[PDB]
Amino acid sequence: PSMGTLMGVYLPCLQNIFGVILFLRLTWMVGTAGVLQALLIVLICCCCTLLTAISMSAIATNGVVPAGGSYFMISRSLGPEFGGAVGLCFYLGTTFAAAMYILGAIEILLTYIAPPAASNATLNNMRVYGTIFLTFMTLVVFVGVKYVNKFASLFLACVIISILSIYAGGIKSIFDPPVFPVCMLGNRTLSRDQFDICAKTAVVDNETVATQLWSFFCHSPNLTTDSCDPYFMLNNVTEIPGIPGAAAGVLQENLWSAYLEKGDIVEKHGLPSADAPSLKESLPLYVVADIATSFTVLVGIFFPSVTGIMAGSNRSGDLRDAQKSIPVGTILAIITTSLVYFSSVVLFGACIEGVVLRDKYGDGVSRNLVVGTLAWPSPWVIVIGSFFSTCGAGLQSLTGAPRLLQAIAKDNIIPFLRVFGHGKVNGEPTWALLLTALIAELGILIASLDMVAPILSMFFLMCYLFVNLACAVQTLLRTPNWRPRFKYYHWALSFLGMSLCLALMFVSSWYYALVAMLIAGMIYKYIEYQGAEKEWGDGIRGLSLSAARYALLRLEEGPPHTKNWRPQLLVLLKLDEDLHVKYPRLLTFASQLKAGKGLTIVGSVIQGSFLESYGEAQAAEQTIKNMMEIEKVKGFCQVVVASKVREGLAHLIQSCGLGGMRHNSVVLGWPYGWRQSEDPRAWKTFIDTVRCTTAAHLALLVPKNIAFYPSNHERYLEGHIDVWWIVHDGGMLMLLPFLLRQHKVWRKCRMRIFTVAQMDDNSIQMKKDLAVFLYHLRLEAEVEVVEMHNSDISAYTYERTLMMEQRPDQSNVRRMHTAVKLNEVIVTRSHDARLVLLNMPGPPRNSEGDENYMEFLEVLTEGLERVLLVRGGGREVI
Amino acid sequence: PSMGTLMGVYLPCLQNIFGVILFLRLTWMVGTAGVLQALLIVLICCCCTLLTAISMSAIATNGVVPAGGSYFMISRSLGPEFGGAVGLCFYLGTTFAAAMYILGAIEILLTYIAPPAAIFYSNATLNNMRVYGTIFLTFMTLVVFVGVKYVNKFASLFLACVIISILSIYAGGIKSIFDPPVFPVCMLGNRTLSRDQFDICAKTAVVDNETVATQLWSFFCHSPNLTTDSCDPYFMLNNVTEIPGIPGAAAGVLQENLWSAYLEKGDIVEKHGLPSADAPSLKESLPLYVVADIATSFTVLVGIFFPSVTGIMAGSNRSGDLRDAQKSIPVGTILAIITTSLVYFSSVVLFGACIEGVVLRDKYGDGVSRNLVVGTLAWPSPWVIVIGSFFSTCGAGLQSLTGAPRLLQAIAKDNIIPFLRVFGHGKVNGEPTWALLLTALIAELGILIASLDMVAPILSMFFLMCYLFVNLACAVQTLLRTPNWRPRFKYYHWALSFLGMSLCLALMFVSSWYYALVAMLIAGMIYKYIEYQGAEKEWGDGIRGLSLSAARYALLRLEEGPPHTKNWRPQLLVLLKLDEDLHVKYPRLLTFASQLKAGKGLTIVGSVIQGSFLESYGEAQAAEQTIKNMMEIEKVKGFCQVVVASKVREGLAHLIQSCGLGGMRHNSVVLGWPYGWRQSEDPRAWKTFIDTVRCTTAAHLALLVPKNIAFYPSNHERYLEGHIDVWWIVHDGGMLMLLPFLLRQHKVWRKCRMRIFTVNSIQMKKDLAVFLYHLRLEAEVEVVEMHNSDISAYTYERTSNVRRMHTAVKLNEVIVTRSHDARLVLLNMPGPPRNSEGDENYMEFLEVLTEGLERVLLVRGGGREVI
Ligand SMILES: *[C@@H]1O[C@H](CO)[C@@H](O[C@@H]2O[C@H](CO)[C@@H](O[C@@H]3O[C@H](CO)[C@@H](O)[C@H](O)[C@@H]3O)[C@H](O)[C@H]2NC(C)=O)[C@H](O)[C@H]1NC(C)=O
Ligand SMILES: *[C@@H]1O[C@H](CO)[C@@H](O[C@@H]2O[C@H](CO)[C@@H](O[C@@H]3O[C@H](CO)[C@@H](O)[C@H](O)[C@@H]3O)[C@H](O)[C@H]2NC(C)=O)[C@H](O)[C@H]1NC(C)=O
Ligand SMILES: *[C@@H]1O[C@H](CO)[C@@H](O)[C@H](O)[C@H]1NC(C)=O
Ligand SMILES: *[C@@H]1O[C@H](CO)[C@@H](O)[C@H](O)[C@H]1NC(C)=O
């Protein structure tokens, strides 16, 4: 299967756009509203269709295009929810379009072709004949689809012959127009059907005698009477030509709006008329305005003539290269249609009188097609041409709606219409054709183009709005599988299309638009619920699971680094031998530092064997959940059963979360009684966990002396948090006290920034820097710099220099002494502090100097009531 | 601090509801719309407010009540997004209410109290309104700036004025019933003349023993002589009557003014039911008939009258100083609503039944001698209602001017919206500083319209937006079972709040659809902006933060509730085994998982890497990228976990039991087959396989062991001829039947024939068929003989080493003679032994059982599978 762009995309879209709306209701629309407002309407109705076509192309290019049709692409590229929603609005639009074309064919048959074989009598004739035609067309569609697909070329040929004849007639009008006298009464419009000739008196047998017009206007058959209406005798009777040759005075004439009312009379603005009363037996003698005309009504009546851009991408499977052949073809069809309407609007407006355009049924002329009056060969070619075009459009719509319904039914998206997929032995639908025919009858029972057209418009506008909105949303949030290759495509275009087509959908009828939107929302949510129930198993719980998975998948792609740094903690609790939380203050501290917003996972390892201790794990999980609910901290809880607690801690540290929902901080407690007991396990386990959390580039929070930390009911009134930032990790060391004081427990503790990084430098510049940095934070904490020394900070400087370059025992003995001098300073100037935060030095590289490192950490925090040590990970930015 | 229900909630709400609409625009509404439609209007405007009061009570009952005010409760109980959105609509409503009350005070000053002080003296009335409203707005802002304390002291007086006014109205009516007042209104045929100009309504009067033309004649006929015939035909053709304007209460008037009489702009107020002979008229007479001022309809009347019943959120405004709020707020608010509704109903009926249908339609009381139309019936004098309404309007304006900037200051100090942080810079006392100025500017921009009949709909739009948002939030949070939302109200049900949302939305669209669209877009923009700011504050990114927050919210909500699903769908964990060069050994497992899930569900891909964590981080990260790429190729959407353990066996276990977050857990482990276990000299592989098998059966997980993974098809291949074989032996029938269906759901197995072979036979077949009806597979069922002795191994393991092999070899014989040419064979395997040493024999069994079959997949049930 391989065919080019032309015979695969261009000709079908053109054949679907040229409909009956042009002939039957273009001239009337142009004359009633003028040339300006008509051109503006055409432009407004082409822009929405252009933005929808661009979005449709952006959809049709990303990835491969499914070979099924025009509904499979939408579904595959926008999800089952959207695809299901789009298919149904399109189905309803198609069945009402078939109905409307049947109405057009009936109207053209009973009014101009042959009126003998026929207020509300006309409506009843329309109903009866439309029902008969619908029956016959449904039967034909049942038996003879092959012949329709055979004869489909003829309908386009007829349309082209008709348009060629119209333009040829115009070009012949410019230099030699036809003759079609329309009769006048002052500034009124007479129906030429009854009268033989329009003249008050005629000369018969050497003398004047009253004409049929007289006898119809005056009840007296003798001229010598004075009991007639004043308007007839007061004004004249003229015979102006109806087809004035092309000129700039006529296009100047019919240039301003002429919106009439229901029942008014078609009047020729620009003739002398002296008003007077009139009888009530004369109204059947003037031409009358049939329906109330406005701007929104004309929008609604014209819109079904620019629809069908989804009909071009309808033989997608039998295409050579669809990605490059569908969009260009569709847009070329749009451009051709827009230019044909513009040129025809201007030619009609500028070539025909402003009073004969308003005869919806061609009353001024002797019951002819008003647009058929200007046609070179004869007015009989356009009538037959439009008749065959209407029949063909009806047949093709009745062929193409049931196929869409059958596809949607066999896709098993909406469950209650599975039966509509019981196709024939060949695949042709059976109980979808019946539903379509019944809805078409329900539409025919209205029997008026001016009321069927807005419903059709609502369905199509809803479909287009949905396509555009889906495209824009999927582009904004970076949907995982959505990458279009179109060059001139940008989500701003789809947004503008949504706005314009929404404005149209609301101009026609706000309440109808609300009903359509509610139907669409109901079907969308119902599809979503059914999909959730089918993938997972539950309705409500299934919805939540699906939302979670969607969010995680979308978060997967993209740069995995955030411009800011906020602590997301993982609290490593240590369960007792009796399965009790040893330090229930860690949970309290986590709740005070997070305040219930963010991610907080709470892991714990249970020594033993997994094969025989599963119930223990479940019990411990419930226990931790209860204890965690009490302290009011909202988080998940993981429990693993390892053989040795060390490897359990490792597996917990490096594997907790799903993709992007990872922790970036490990808060572990302090080992108490490590030197007291003879078992040296404690400090080696602690140091091993420290080394394992520093090699994964994670932050570290080691709250020392956890038994003295406040509870949530406690409150502090006087006190000041103390920060003792030594060299590095300034960002997190400044971000912690702020997030802490944001809680009511530390609601008003004064912050004091103590800095010890003299390094033979000046504090004046560092004070200005700290203050300006604090200005953005707005903490405004007092900054004081203590007189620091290089030899005093030697322990930290060694590591700092090594870190800068990257960007033992001799040193350790010195480190202990520096640790004790620093401890002396801090305990003499910050003893009475409420909470003290200072950054700790990194663990040694040598696996044996760990005891000295522990002695350093113990002699450093000697005397301080409450001290929290934080170690940076190195990837923190702010 | 402790004060009761009455003086803490009831009276403030009453003071906020009874407003100026009642006096200035009730009679006009009743006369224009009739009695019936008036009752309907009152009912419609009371129902939306009643449902909103019920939802507000449900909010005020869950948990403890914040002591701050009326905005803190909403925030704490509905989240920062909703609470922030509500605050702005309520703020705008309050400032426009200040504007409307000022307009009411100006209108009452220029029309009844003193008409000479009309400086401008059409558009002159509008310009006078503009100037005087500006002067008052300035003066009231300054007063509110300096003297809040005296306002808080004198606030009771305004309520005293309102109550005395209403009591006087009813006293006047009751006096009307048996002895009415006198207020003659003059008539011309069936029109209504303005009684201000004429001295007396009579065509001719007798002066000095003779008749002379009266002032009415000179106004209608410009000639001062009776002997003239150059006047309009309407004056001479019709009569001049003087009907009483206040007929005492009776059933004849309520019978008259009972149907709607919507006029048009410029029409004439006509008394239906009087003799009138029509005739043309001049154009210099229009200044002498009373005229309808604006076009009247039904929707217009709803829009103008809705502000009267607003203010139910002002009752829960001294929340901190309350004795027991949970039992005192709802009952107080609802009693205030009921009292207001009954007062309106009784007053509507009283007006309908006491006043003529022609004097109700003079919006400014022209038929009567420029009096307050409602003041005609009042016992002491019509002077009590005028002064009463003046003081009431000034007091309500003052309190709105006091209560709006305070709310803005609260929102600014809550630090939700960042660009209005400056508005929290209160004075030394707490009185707002740059919030009062902004409020005064908005009030001026509202005054520039200078017409109650045009300001009222804007006020209504904002208040309706607030109520709709409250109701919708309550209903949704009750439906989705948010974790921290449990209301204690007795008569509360999410259907009621939903119905309230529907009704108040209907109102919002009846009044003016376009305004409703603008309000909804403002609300949506602020809602999404608050959500974005919350994301920026918790996580760090705007978009990535939004996604993280959505994920966390979904997981937390899914946490609570029954942890068992009615259905069972496989959620796989594919255990890949990386090579020494960090390449996927069997990339066909990922293909098989993608075929079994079809891209919908959860699929985690774990793998263990032997070594030490301290020195092997980069290898793990590189392997993570490798697995992600290989998984992207096969088109399977899933997450990837890699852990670095010491001994692989141990790492596996930890991978099996800890993967996921809370409720997003796996329930099926698909591991490959150990190849070369007996051929390999070392016995390390089977020792690992058996350990993973034993560990995954003790966690109650299903098990899928695809054997011979090197012959499984890829995605590009297609099958035309073949038949899947299922060999369900004893147990695990549900999942053994659900697997082939989910498999054939993919295009690769799109049309492979399914054959069910099952080791009373009619009863069993009937059961399989009835079960198959729901599934709809309709696959052919073939039941081979069932020997208990042959299957003894499965029965004995569920509920002799030499015998094991004999049964396995007979079963292998049967399967290979009746299913050798099968495409895919699925059969359930027996459980591994409890003894840790018979693993070699167990492996020999498993090897000799599936001997000859090209492709065989073995499934073992977990035991908690339902379908
Ligand atoms: C066709 O002829 C009739 C009668 O001559 C035109 O009637 C229009 O409307 C009324 C009579 O129905 C007259 O207009 C009056 O004009 C004054 C001056 O502004 C205005 O104050 C009145 O309210 C009324 O509009 C007059 O006969 C004529 N007026 C206009 C502006 O057309 C009718 O318009 C004619 N139709 C055409 C010319 O298309
Ligand atoms: C006050 O008197 C005026 C003038 O008489 C009333 O206006 C006109 O009243 C007459 C008599 O009711 C109406 O005539 C009726 O017209 C309708 C069709 O419009 C016809 O079906 C009836 O059989 C009858 O002929 C006339 O329409 C009406 N309006 C005008 C412009 O003449 C006025 O209605 C009286 N007040 C009230 C409250 O009725
Ligand atoms: C009617 O036509 C006659 C014939 O020319 C003309 O004289 C007369 O003025 C016309 N009347 C009007 C009202 O134009
Ligand atoms: C005016 O009133 C007199 C008083 O009886 C009455 O006779 C006359 O008919 C009235 N005029 C009309 C037009 O009814």
Numbering used by the authors:
A (entry chain A): 116 to 233, 244 to 932, 1011 to 1081
B (entry chain B): 116 to 236, 244 to 881, 887 to 926, 1014 to 1081
Provide passages from the article that reported this PDB entry.
Potassium‐coupled chloride transporters (KCCs) play crucial roles in regulating cell volume and intracellular chloride concentration. They are characteristically inhibited under isotonic conditions via phospho‐regulatory sites located within the cytoplasmic termini. Decreased inhibitory phosphorylation in response to hypotonic cell swelling stimulates transport activity, and dysfunction of this regulatory process has been associated with various human diseases. Here, we present cryo‐EM structures of human KCC3b and KCC1, revealing structural determinants for phospho‐regulation in both N‐ and C‐termini.
To gain further insights into the structure KCCs in an activated, non‐phosphorylated state, we took advantage of an N‐terminally deleted variant of the closely related KCC1 transporter (KCC1Δ19) with deleted N‐terminal OSR‐1‐binding motif H/RFXV (residues 3‐6 in full‐length KCC1 (Austin et␣al, 2014)). Interestingly, 3D classification of the KCC1Δ19 dataset yielded two conformations that differ mainly in the degree of the counter‐clockwise CTD twist and the inter‐subunit distances between the central TM11/12 helices. The coexistence of two alternating CTD conformations in KCC1Δ19 is indicative of an increased flexibility around the TM‐CTD‐connecting scissor helices compared to KCC3b‐PM. Helix α8 moves from a position close to the central β‐sheet to a position further away from the TM region, over a distance of 30.6 Å (Cα–Cα distance of T926 in state 1 and state 2), by undergoing a 47° rotation around the β7 strand. In these two alternative conformations, α8 is either located above or below the α10 helix. The first state of the α8 helix close to the centre of CTD resembles our KCC3b‐PM structure and the structure of wild‐type KCC3b published by another group while this work was under review (Chi et␣al, 2020). Inspection of the electron density in this region of the KCC1 map suggests that either ADP or ATP are bound to the Rossmann‐like fold formed by β‐strands β1, β2 and β4 and helices α1, α3, α4 of the KCC1 inner lobe. Weaker density for the γ‐phosphate indicates that a mixture of ADP‐ and ATP‐bound particles may contribute the observed densities.
